[PDB]
Structure 1
Amino acid sequence: MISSVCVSSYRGRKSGNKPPSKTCLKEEMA
């Protein structure tokens, strides 16, 4: 996950996750 601190846990489809094909929808602070 980050800095070798966490692995990943579960896939990326928990009914609400960042999609790889759709990563351009202002996910930052507005």
Structure 2
Amino acid sequence: MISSVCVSSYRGRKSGNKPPSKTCLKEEMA
């Protein structure tokens, strides 16, 4: 695997669409 932090370094490494301003992930979990 790739040594990363809590996240698995997956394509959705945008921070995830939080409850407000869902623009971080904006890529179906990728």
Give the alignment's TM-score, normalised by structure 2. Answer: 0.15
Higher relative contact order (CA closer than 8 Å, sequence separation 6+): 2
Q: Which runs of 5+ in 2 are unaligned?
A: none
Instruction: Could you list the structure 1 runs, at least 4 aligned residues long, displaced by more than 2 angstroms after superposition.
Output: 1-20, 26-30
1:2-26 deviation digits (Å, cap 9, x = unpaired): 9999999999999999997110115
Relative distance call for 1:11 and 1:18 in structure 2 (3 A) is: farther
